[PDB]
Amino acid sequence: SRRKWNKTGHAVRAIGRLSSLENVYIMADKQKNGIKANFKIRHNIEDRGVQLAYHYQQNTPIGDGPVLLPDNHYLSVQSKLSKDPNEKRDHMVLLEFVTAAGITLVSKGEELFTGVVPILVELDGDVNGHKFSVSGEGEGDATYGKLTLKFICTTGKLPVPWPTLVTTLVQCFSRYPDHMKQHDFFKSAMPEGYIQERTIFFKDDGNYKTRAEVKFEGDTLVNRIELKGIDFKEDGNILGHKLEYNTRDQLTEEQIAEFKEAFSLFDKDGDGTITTKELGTVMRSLGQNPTEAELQDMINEVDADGNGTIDFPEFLTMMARKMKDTDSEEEIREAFRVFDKDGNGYISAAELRHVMTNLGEKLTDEEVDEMIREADIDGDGQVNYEEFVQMMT
Ligand SMILES: [Ca+2]
Ligand SMILES: [Ca+2]
Ligand SMILES: [Ca+2]
Ligand SMILES: [Ca+2]
């Protein structure tokens, strides 16, 4: 049928994911007696395209009491942005889940986070001289890494898109699994708290410099932030409000079933989890040729439970996130070059066969030709970049 495109499409999408770095990477910073962090955020642009935001982060304790300095690991975020239909003001309702991972198979401040903690957020900002203030409130549940908050823009209309402020607007609320509790800097510095500093680069546009104090005041965890933006284009995605607000949907029974079909290409023994050896097989037959260390690495990107293998659920989660976010054109080109083997700019009937045969799928010519026939918008008997993009959505 045509669901041969979706299958192998998603299989290339998956290797795309396992090759990139989408998490919050955290490292010791001994000099500053703290941590450093870096990560990339993808903001969907209205209709097509992505606006990427590269983050650099630094945290320093406010007090003198000993702190935990972690081995490298990451946080994994799931954000949901919504509207309060009763809210007249410019606002953002936020639901967020955050888990630590990245290390395969316990401080005094960790005690302060065992129940539900109230949160207050206070931001003053200035982007290209357009000043604004955001006020926020809600709760945090470190037990499940859960955050629920509502933010009001107290100065009227917010001059930047709400999504762009999510990372600035309390990582002490992340769930650290049992085996990684010695690595939780954030809770370790409570109640006195930390300074959190960031520079955020919006590609082809300006940057935010942020500084925040995160500490307890009485029984509330408070985040007080100042933000400065410069070099922004007034017609760009930020100042021009061209960024999608709504967290793209949930998942069809139809979509889940497609991700399962891809999953089975990797899970060749049908045991419900993907090994390094299984990942390798698919990649070699796809032309690439990675080391045992890379495979451990790619798997570690998505290995929620740290067992060294991608479990079926872990795989769904991974795919759900990869479908919610848009790939950059660089990334889509790489997906193309997997097919366009000679690199002429076009996927030939012959090239498409070569790939499928290798993926473990014998298919007749009318079969192959039909796939080609399906994607062929103009009708040159091949698939070019523009045709490919439209058939990878
Ligand atoms: Ca397996
Ligand atoms: Ca796993
Ligand atoms: Ca070609
Ligand atoms: Ca064509």
Swiss-Prot record:
Query: Per its UniProt record, what InterPro entries does this chain match?
Result: GFP, GFP-related, Green_fluorescent_prot
Q: What is the effect of changing residue 72 to I?
A: In mut2.1; shifts fluorescence lifetime from 3.03 to 2.50 ns
- PTM statement from Swiss-Prot or TrEMBL: Contains a chromophore consisting of modified amino acid residues. Maturation of the chromophore requires nothing other than molecular oxygen.
> In UniProt terms, what is the effect of altering residue 41 to T?
In P11; increases fluorescence at 475 nm excitation and at warmer temperatures such as 37 degrees Celsius. In Esmerald; leads to brighter fluorescence. In VisGreen; leads to brighter fluorescence
Write out the GO biological process terms: bioluminescence; generation of precursor metabolites and energy
Q: Which SUPFAM superfamilies match?
A: GFP-like
- Uses in industry and biotechnology: Green fluorescent protein has been engineered to produce a vast number of variously colored mutants, fusion proteins, and biosensors. Further generation of mutants led to more stable proteins (at 37 degrees Celsius for example) with brighter fluorescence and longer fluorescence lifetimes.
Q: Where are the transmembrane segments?
A: none
Q: In which tissues is it expressed?
A: Photocytes.
Short name of any one Pfam family annotated for the protein? GFP
- Outcome after substituting residue 174 to A: Increases fluorescence at warmer temperatures such as 37 degrees Celsius. In GFPmut 3; highly fluorescent mutant when excited at 488 nm
Q: What are the record keywords, sorted?
A: Chromophore, Luminescence, Photoprotein
Effect of mutating residue 171 to H: In P4; leads to no detectable fluorescence. In mut2.2; shifts fluorescence lifetime from 3.03 to 1.94 ns. In mut3.3; shifts fluorescence lifetime from 3.03 to 1.88 ns
Outcome after substituting residue 170 to L: In EYFP; leads to yellow fluorescence, folds faster and more efficiently at 37 degrees Celsius and has superior solubility and brightness
Is Flavoprotein a UniProt keyword of this protein?
Answer: no
Q: What function does the entry list?
A: Energy-transfer acceptor. Its role is to transduce the blue chemiluminescence of the protein aequorin into green fluorescent light by energy transfer. Fluoresces in vivo upon receiving energy from the Ca(2+)-activated photoprotein aequorin.
What subunit structure does UniProt give? Monomer.
Return the similarity comment: Belongs to the GFP family.
Q: What is this protein called?
A: Green fluorescent protein
Which source organism does the UniProt entry give? Aequorea victoria (Water jellyfish)
